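Case 454 in the screening queue. Each case pairs one protein sequence with one candidate compound; here the compound is G0D. For every case the pipeline is the same: read the inputs, emit a complex structure as tokens, and attach any notable structural observations.

Predict complex for case 454.
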Amino acid sequence: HSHGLFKKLGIPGPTPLPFLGNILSYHKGFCMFDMECHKKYGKVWGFYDGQQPVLAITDPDMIKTVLVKECYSVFTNRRPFGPVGFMKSAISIAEDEEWKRLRSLLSPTFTSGKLKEMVPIIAQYGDVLVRNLRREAETGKPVTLKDVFGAYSMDVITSTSFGVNIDSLNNPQDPFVENTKKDFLDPFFLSITVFPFLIPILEVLNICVFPREVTNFLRKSVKRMKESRLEDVDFLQLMIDSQNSKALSDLELVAQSIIFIFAGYETTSSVLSFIMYELATHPDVQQKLQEEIDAVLPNKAPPTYDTVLQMEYLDMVVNETLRLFPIAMRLERVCKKDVEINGMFIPKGVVVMIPSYALHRDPKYWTEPEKFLPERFSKKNKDNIDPYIYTPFGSGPRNCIGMRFALMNMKLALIRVLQNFSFKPCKETQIPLKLSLGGLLQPEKPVVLKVESR
Ligand code: HEM
Ligand SMILES: CC(C)(C)OC(=O)N[C@@H](CS[C@H](Cc1ccccc1)C(=O)NCc1cccnc1)Cc1ccccc1
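Case 454 output:
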């Protein structure tokens, strides 16, 4: 069989069913299954997504070795994913030297210096956010954060990636908003894990998990802008300026544009929802932050790149949220060679997995781990936190390239919104929040809260 491998290496795990492997155990979802396995088996364990062996690892030295020490050499790519179509060229899907080349060609886009240049742009839609929120707070109707934050995240994306400027909550039907707004335990991807041999089938059928129509709209919408700016501060331009030299192709450039939307749309919006839920169910933290924000920005002063880094309690709130809700859930690299790391034989072809969610909630590193307690990130206690236990942006050469941009994007939305409003539970607010038993880190029920004007 293929299912004998962990039994042979003396590695414990749950016993796999033929063909299926352990996937029925995802019925309660990745994270609950990860927690269970941690408790039941210890520091290392194995399971099978279908015939695919996955070794979980939770020792910080070993995690360091995989994520940083042996990245370029051994643990370079994520778990194969498909069908992708032309998206094979997206950085996050790309493999080995094409990844190394893409990552280089795109790293200077995400510098502090280029980020500081984008703060004015990400600020103006904080204002747009307020005015849409006020229209909902002067009419004391409970608000669904995912639509209004979704509208906001969506606003920052189009602006920061193509210079297109819209109020997606208000022009929700402009052509540029439709395509762009468009789960690994849904019927489709569970089937991909049992029948991964079916991927090269869909590839030759140009069936793509990225719908073939959105990809066509932006391939052409990009080339319109490309040739309307060429010739006559955003991500697209920064990429156009890069291929003005091994340099970035034209279809390669459309693909990265798409990964950036997918990356910062549901994530920026989802995280902000998780932070407003905790702010509302912990109103002292909410007050403590409103004070810190008014002290650095008095009279509702507009935030700047520099003032944002000045805020310590703000950063603590963000970091403690991502501890409870690390939206990647897991990190993963494919072992490309027989290797021994930190005293353990890892055979070629195993997927190596770091169960972030489960370690963020591990009582052996965290006190009262399910309690929302920002103080664990105080300049006092922030030093007692293992950066290979807390990894909401991954770690090493393949960590989240957009990390600085995402923290800034979120913090700008939070500052402007707590400058103006307070957030209180409704009776229809789900307390305590229940995580989706599905395949995405998101709430069972969408977070609804009451909004009031300061
Ligand atoms: C709060 C929001 C976000 C979180 C928590 C987050 C988290 C992550 C994590 C955990 C990874 C994988 C890291 C690893 O495997 O070690 C990742 C990868 C990535 N993220 Fe983010 N991310 C966020 C937002 C963004 C944004 C806004 C962008 C915008 C460009 C972005 C672009 C990427 C890319 C391109 C990768 C793949 C990097 C590579 O393989 O070279 N992400 N993110
Ligand atoms: C089947 C299996 C689970 C093994 O593989 C994958 O999920 N791998 C992805 C390709 S790695 C990359 C990193 C990533 C993936 C999934 C969750 C978090 C981070 C990616 O794509 N980040 C878009 C994005 C999201 C959040 C933060 N930053 C970036 C496929 C993909 C997902 C979503 C949009 C586009 C592509």
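Case 454 observations:
- The longest helix spans residues 119-137.
- Residues 78-79, 81, 92-93, 184, 259, 262-263, 267, 328, 332, 400 surround G0D (ligand 2) (CB under 6 Å).
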